Amino acid sequence: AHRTLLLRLSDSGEPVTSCSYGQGVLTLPSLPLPQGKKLGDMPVYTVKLAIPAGSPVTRDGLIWTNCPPDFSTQFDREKFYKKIIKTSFHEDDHIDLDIYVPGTYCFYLSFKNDKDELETTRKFYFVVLPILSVNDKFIPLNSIAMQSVVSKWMGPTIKDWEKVFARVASKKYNMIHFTPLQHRGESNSPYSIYDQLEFDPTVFKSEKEVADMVERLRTEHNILSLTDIVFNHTANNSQWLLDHPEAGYNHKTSPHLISAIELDKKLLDFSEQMEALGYPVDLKTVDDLIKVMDGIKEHVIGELKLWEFYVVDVKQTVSELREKWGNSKSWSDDNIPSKDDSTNLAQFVRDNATEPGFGSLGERGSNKINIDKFAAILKKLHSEDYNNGIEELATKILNDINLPFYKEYDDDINEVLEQLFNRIKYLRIDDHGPKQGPITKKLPLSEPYFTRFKAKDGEEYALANNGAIWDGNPLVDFASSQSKAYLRREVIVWGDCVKLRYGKGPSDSPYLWERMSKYVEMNARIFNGFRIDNCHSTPLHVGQYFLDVARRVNPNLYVVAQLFSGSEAMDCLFVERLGISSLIREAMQAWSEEELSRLVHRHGGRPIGSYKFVPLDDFPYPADVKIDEEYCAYNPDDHSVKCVSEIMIPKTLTATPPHALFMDCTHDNETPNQKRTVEDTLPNAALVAFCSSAIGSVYGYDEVFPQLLDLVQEKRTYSCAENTGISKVKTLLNNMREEIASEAVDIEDSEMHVHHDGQYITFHRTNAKNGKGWYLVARTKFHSSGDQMLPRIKLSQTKATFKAAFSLERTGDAPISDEIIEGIPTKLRELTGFDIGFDENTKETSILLPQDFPQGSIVIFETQQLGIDDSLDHFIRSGAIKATEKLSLESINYVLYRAEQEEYDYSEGRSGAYDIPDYGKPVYCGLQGWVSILRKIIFYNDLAHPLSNNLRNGHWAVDYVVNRLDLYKDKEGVAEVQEWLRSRMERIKQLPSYLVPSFFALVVGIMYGCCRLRAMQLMSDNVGKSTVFVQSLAMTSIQMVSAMKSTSILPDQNIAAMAAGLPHFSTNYMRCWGRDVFISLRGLLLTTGRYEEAKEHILAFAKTLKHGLIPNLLDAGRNPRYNARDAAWFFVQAIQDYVTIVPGGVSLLQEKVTRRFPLDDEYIPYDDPKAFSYSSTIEEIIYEILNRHAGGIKYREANAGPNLDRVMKDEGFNVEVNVDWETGLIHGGSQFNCGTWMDKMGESEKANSVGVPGTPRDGAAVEINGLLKSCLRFVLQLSKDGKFKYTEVTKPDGSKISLSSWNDLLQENFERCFYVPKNKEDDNKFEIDATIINRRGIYKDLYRSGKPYEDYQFRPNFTIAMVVAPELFTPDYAAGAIELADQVLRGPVGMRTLDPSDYNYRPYYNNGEDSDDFATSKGRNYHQGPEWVWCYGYFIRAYHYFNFLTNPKCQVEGSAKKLKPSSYLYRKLYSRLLKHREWIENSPWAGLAELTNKDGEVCNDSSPTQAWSTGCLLDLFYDLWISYEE
Ligand SMILES: OC[C@H]1O[C@H](O[C@H]2[C@H](O)[C@@H](O)[C@@H](O[C@H]3[C@H](O)[C@@H](O)[C@@H](O[C@H]4[C@H](O)[C@@H](O)[C@@H](O[C@H]5[C@H](O)[C@@H](O)[C@@H](O)O[C@@H]5CO)O[C@@H]4CO)O[C@@H]3CO)O[C@@H]2CO)[C@H](O)[C@@H](O)[C@@H]1O
Ligand SMILES: OC[C@H]1O[C@H](O[C@H]2[C@H](O)[C@@H](O)[C@@H](O[C@H]3[C@H](O)[C@@H](O)[C@@H](O)O[C@@H]3CO)O[C@@H]2CO)[C@H](O)[C@@H](O)[C@@H]1O
Ligand SMILES: OC[C@H]1O[C@H](O[C@H]2[C@H](O)[C@@H](O)[C@@H](O)O[C@@H]2CO)[C@H](O)[C@@H](O)[C@@H]1O
């Protein structure tokens, strides 16, 4: 049905970790195939990759993967396959990788670099676990019970083995591991295989004989089987080692070990004649070792020629020097240092006059000097005559060359004999282990480092045996040339083995690779899996090829590994590439009771009440996504992986720790009897079995065998004593786990708590889905440490039930049968007396232990949490979509956002945000305020966060989420959204307190995703199908557009109104500024589809026209303020943006709007009937601006005084505007009025800045006239199409200028008046005074302003005209100027409001500073350095247009040669929005800020989410979509 996992990829192609589960491996869940389906009838899993839109890997991007395309295709490690990434700047691309058979699969990416070269990412691996079933029942990988048995101790007949089989079948083990059943070598140890392709002839003969026995175990006792596979060595007496002696490391294949061979045979030649002339054979004296090492420091070390293996033969170089005296003379260079610098001189001869392999160990005299090149230097340095002190000089050089070799020799020798007298002690003289057997044909003084034989080729060989080191890195092959192990004698050799030499591939050892393959695929035909001993010592490429060969034979191969790498990462990397399915963990390794508790905690599961993952605000919500209406698209028999909620966002694939196979005792560690006692066998195996993983045990652990059986020597047979030891308990433990394996699935479905009080260890196991669980109390018997009483066990909101209890007791010692390995007699005594109290008020359960609970005892309780039933996951993950059905884009504002001051408007000052103790308040009262805090908590599973603490300390926040919506209950769909929350929050409170936090975030997160999806559904298609970064900016519309009670856009009705920004510009009069509204009107409402809401805003300000202007501070129409020379032209520009985008937008012009003002600019006749008298259509309103602007406007700030502005003096009150018709631009403003977007009013009394405007923009602002040209260009085409009835503007005096002529006057004079030429030659045409100038290639900021140097200032204001009126700009002048702004005025997220070179560059805004610095005090520096995000929008808007026309690399066109940009241009756009993507991504407030200090430093005062800061970035995405994505 639906077995699809989502694997999100980063901008660099790396997988995204959805949760922090630690250093892990991308593993896919072990689930059975669907009902009646075999391998091949359908895909096992579908990995859906997600590549971001516009990422650097989209540029000519491909997806490589070794996943075979279909089931008919086999697997090859290097046979990758191409997949095309569908590039887009809006829509992310999904690519499926259907998997048909388990194994190891990797993927990498190829893309086009910024250097236009090819580049590749890492190989990223993911593993699909095999499907284990015995008769037909699926065996979950974490319900496996493995019983390891040694072959040579089970009787010499097949039926003798089937007696041992029936014994472990009663103990209810489901899997058996075998030591390899092959013909064993000389030592008969099970790991020195005589012939890998021949099974042990004592028992079986044919291959069907062993295959029929393993299938018998499957059909008789329901037991799967697996075997050890030996890669690293073979027996030291194989009849094929004589034919192919090159399969191992010999003097030919690895010549560096020759120095170690002549030393090993210097001891087999010494340990048989040592005492003959020496003295001590086997004495237990310190002096005996000294004289033995004195016999060593005189007959082996000193008898090997001072080791010429390092030192250059001094006198044999001078002899070979003079022998020719360099007939080939060839040095005239001066690269030789002076003879004084004897250090570099020695290195110089070493770097030039040496045969290849200098320093590299090989033959006896393999480090020699190139004579013809050495005598050439000697003739150059000293003399061309030999008798001129060459014998002294040449020897002086070589002696200094061998000084680092003489000291490398002393460091080697000191380690050879120090390792010797340290092991021969432990080998013989009982330090802690004795057996002092003297000289022998099997036990000399030194163990055999090399196996000697005479091969069939005739020559003699000396293959080495493998072993181990101490703390040495196991990845380093000690048998390779990189290690000096066999020489320095640091090898714990295993004589029965012979280190097998694999190369870089089958090319280095052909017969070894061919024989091991046929040996691996022979066992793969029979068994269900393998066990790899010392896998960390097997090289990766060796195991990768052989495990793939096995999986091609057995597709469901189950691999267990003994993996000990230095880091968890290397262990993960080994599991990633090799395809390992289980990592062995040993319980006997814990030295104390505390270490076993920590080992148990590691593989036990996740904490109780652990957080669950939910797609929050970090996911794209496509409006065209499938859904399960009531979590009903999951039939059980389909075995489909479930999505998180009703929204079918598939289950994310994240790196999880590799699965573990916990062994209470392996076949190599000592017996509980040896390390601890025989009593601890019961609690140890009880804590092991309770873990959430696979378990295993060696045979003899349950039967309480005496001591660890030596796998080399012993020949005794297992005893047939049935039901001994723990056999009765393991039958209860394994059968219990069989019931749990039915419903325990994912990592979030198995929770656990462990406690350690002395010799007791507590294990609480819990299934998070149903509430079921077990409680285990195990008293550990490491040492008999006296009577200890455990306190009262108190369970919260739970009920307990006694299951069983036991105690293992020793009834003396074990028999000493020399024919059968019998165990220790043990009594299994069932216990009682466990008092289970249950308070029926607090629902608390108390458990008390009886005084008779000795060490080596356990007791098991079956628990069940109250409140949690099986139908709880279904109730919470359903109904949220239907609840959000009636939501509107306005109503979703109250569900998710609402700042605290906005909430106070509806609650009259009684509610606000739920103050989380020891933290603060969420940013929004809605769900978003929780989600921003909850996401990083769920990611880190932080149950210690103050939010998690408060959630389990009470139910205050649980009811606060539901009780807020009483303020907004009457709005569209909120009542049904609140009702869903109320019913789910009610069900949550009936749960244990520690489980409220995990379920609280889940209920909030699911209702959040269905609300955010409801937003993409109501909005348009360009938004709903885009990337998270686009949808994140789109939600700002819902944020800003909110109905209030203290304000609105209409004076008669409190309807929806757009805020300038949260939280400061959201309440009362300071909410909707006309300038801020209409700059954002195209980005927040038009780009998203809020046409009706955008029309209401246009009609609302149309009633407030006065002085031929649109008011800045809109007082909902109830007496506003008209200090806005900028508002009217951003307002009329939004009219053009409305008609251009909205289908049928021309209807706006003929929309009557009740003119609440006498057109003759009067005072404030508010309720006077003249307000409700006449109206003016938008058409009239538009022309009213133009005609009155240049024609007739003359006003002082109406109804002024401190009531209006307190600081702005009377000089700023009387302000005006006039168009110089000899240029056509809109001049106006005073040096006392800040009627532009840079509206700053001084207020520092301590600097005499009171009333002084911070940035007065009198004259012709680039933005004002730029929007005027766009207005004129629009109104012309309006009449050409047949609407706008006006064509001539009335001149002030009484004349009549034409509109197209006014449109032409700007076109003929605008760029002439503003542009500053880069060349001083053309300063005579563009009206420039070169004395007051800053940078050339600059478009002006103001024309004939008050202070003429504010004219020639680099500011981001010109780019508004570059976007609304591109016809005023010649391409090369505009592109050359916008590149300067990108190099100077562009911050990371905000646009610098002033050139950093200009003296007035104060880029640190501080409105609390009340000092004497004119700018910094009281925030006068507002627009003199600080970086604003909205100007960045218009900047990159024109950066797209002009760099498209100008530079040709940004062009490639395509279909119908429609001009479409290139990947290089999209790469220049994407790279300038990632600092913006970061901001909203990692900001609590979901949005971009109003301000930003120098280089993105968070301005403390800046409103964190601003309207026109985000709408200006949404404007860019509409251009790239409406002009190319067709
Ligand atoms: O509602 C009726 C109202 O009547 C009178 O109103 C006028 C004010 O007295 C008058 O000063 C002016 O308001 C000015 C404002 O004083 C001025 O400083 C400037 O606005 C700037 C700030 O200068 C600037 O520091 C910054 O302030 C933000 C801050 O950055 C932000 O982090 C957060 O702290 O919020 C602060 C604002 O609260 O930005 C603002 C952006 O405007 O210009 C304003 C005019 O545009 O005009 C008022 C006109 O009614 C009474 O005086 C007033 O008390 C009554 O409330
Ligand atoms: O109650 C309103 C207002 O009354 C007072 O303000 C007035 C001044 O007292 C009065 O002198 C005058 O001040 C202005 C000058 O007439 C004008 O020529 C120019 O110099 O600007 C002066 C300041 O505006 O008129 C104002 C009108 O408000 C009183 O001081 C205020 O506190 C009080 O709010
Ligand atoms: O102060 C001179 C210094 O700053 C300049 O910028 C302004 C200056 O701040 C004004 O006082 C006046 O001199 O006009 C200058 C140009 O607009 C320049 O940025 C700088 O090169 C100059 O040395």
XYZ file of C-alpha atoms in Angstrom, residues 139 240 358 367 431 480 580 867 1121 1160 1220 1272 1444 1468 1474:
15
model
C 10.694 -12.720 13.366
C 45.954 -26.088 -0.724
C 64.837 4.191 1.101
C 68.489 0.852 1.645
C 51.898 -13.449 37.549
C 50.929 -4.905 5.984
C 25.638 -5.324 9.165
C -5.475 6.296 30.467
C -2.016 62.433 9.845
C -11.363 71.482 -0.534
C 9.432 71.802 -11.689
C 1.917 57.993 -15.784
C 19.194 39.771 -17.217
C 23.519 34.725 -7.970
C 20.247 32.168 2.210
